[PDB]
Design an enzyme around this catalytic site. Structure first.
Site, PDB file in Angstrom:
ATOM      1  N   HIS A  28      -5.274  -5.749  -0.905  1.00  0.00           N
ATOM      2  CA  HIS A  28      -4.746  -7.042  -1.328  1.00  0.00           C
ATOM      3  C   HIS A  28      -4.270  -6.995  -2.773  1.00  0.00           C
ATOM      4  CE1 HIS A  28      -5.630 -10.805  -3.595  1.00  0.00           C
ATOM      5  NE2 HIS A  28      -4.772 -11.286  -2.715  1.00  0.00           N
ATOM      6  N   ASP A  50      -5.592  -5.214   4.723  1.00  0.00           N
ATOM      7  CA  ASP A  50      -5.406  -4.585   3.424  1.00  0.00           C
ATOM      8  C   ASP A  50      -6.371  -3.420   3.267  1.00  0.00           C
ATOM      9  OD1 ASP A  50      -3.566  -6.608   3.005  1.00  0.00           O
ATOM     10  OD2 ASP A  50      -5.021  -7.890   1.973  1.00  0.00           O
ATOM     11  N   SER A 102     -12.591  -8.577  -6.425  1.00  0.00           N
ATOM     12  CA  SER A 102     -12.138  -8.390  -5.052  1.00  0.00           C
ATOM     13  C   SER A 102     -12.720  -7.117  -4.458  1.00  0.00           C
ATOM     14  CB  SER A 102     -10.608  -8.340  -5.005  1.00  0.00           C
ATOM     15  OG  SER A 102     -10.108  -7.296  -5.817  1.00  0.00           O
TER      16      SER A 102
END
Lengths: 151, 46, 151
Positions: A28, A50, A102
């Site tokens: 991502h 992703d 993330s």
């Protein structure tokens, strides 16, 4: 365990983590992956997925154990304490689960990474997340609660 | 003479193919020495 | 138990082992079999199977007990210690499982030879092997992980 931040401009922007069976990188976000062994691996991204293809030599293959069905509500060891819920993502404390971190795996207490977070910044006075895992029979499906942004 | 030659060569080629196919049909019986469940096929298994 | 090395040039090159029901010799390699009783037995090799026909008089017949389905992950006594795995061959220690010792049976702790190795030299920082055993319902099928050579 090999969970690695992603190097962008010489600072952490993502967090790549290798999983059982296949090596995983959250595609991502971008940024040069810190690990040199992963620095020479082709990228396989789908339209909504992703994930990096697993191209590590099979010496360190399957660093983890994947997660089966039958989600208990019990404790799952998270980077910031345990998490306890079953219907959806755990009611993480306010302030925690914000942004910039993330690609963080939630693992079972038995060493079985139940799911992979892909956002879910805020869900109210508590907070759930948008993650991906097996659907019911082992299907890599993502669930995104409304108001989900990468964390 | 030509016809008898060609028909006999065709027949011998067919029988060689028969033997080879028979060998292939013998091959799965690798499971036969294993003393396992009957398979209920063209060959016999107690 | 009668597990016998194969005599080639007066040194061990293989390892013949007799099994329940039928006498077994790994026909992948050659060399005169050390045992004189086996020295006068015809050979029955298939296209991919390297097994000797059982022609020992039925006095010493069925030296071992064969292995049924339902593979546990538990300990199987191997020539070099126990082995513990279920999905595939056990993660044998590095260095062990190299070459030159072809035809070694892996047995259950209960005396039930689970499988027969037919290679699988290296599988990374750990090592699995290429072996043959019953498939699910008692079918003599070989499984060969990638990067498998006779050991």
């Amino acid at each position: 365990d090999k969970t690695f931040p992603i190097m962008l401009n010489g600072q952490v922007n993502g967090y790549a983590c290798v999983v059982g069976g296949r090596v995983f990188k959250p595609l991502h976000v971008e940024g040069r992956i810190d690990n040199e062994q992963l620095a020479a691996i082709k990228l396989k991204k789908a339209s909504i997925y992703d994930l990096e293809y697993g191209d590590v030599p099979q010496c360190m293959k399957s660093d983890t154990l994947q997660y089966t069905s039958d989600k208990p509500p019990g404790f799952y060891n998270w980077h910031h304490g345990a998490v306890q819920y079953e219907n959806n993502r755990f009611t993480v404390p306010r302030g925690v689960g914000g942004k910039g971190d993330s690609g963080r795996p939630i693992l079972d207490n038995k060493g079985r990474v139940v799911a992979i977070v892909l956002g879910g910044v805020n869900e109210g006075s508590r907070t759930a997340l948008s993650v991906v895992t097996w659907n019911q029979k082992g299907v890599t499906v993502k669930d995104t609660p409304e108001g989900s942004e990468p964390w | 003479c030509t016809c008898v030659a060609i028909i006999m060569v065709s027949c011998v080629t067919s029988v060689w193919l028969l033997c080879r196919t028979r060998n292939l049909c013998i091959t799965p019986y690798k499971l036969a020495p294993n003393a396992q469940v009957p398979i209920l096929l063209a060959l016999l298994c107690c």
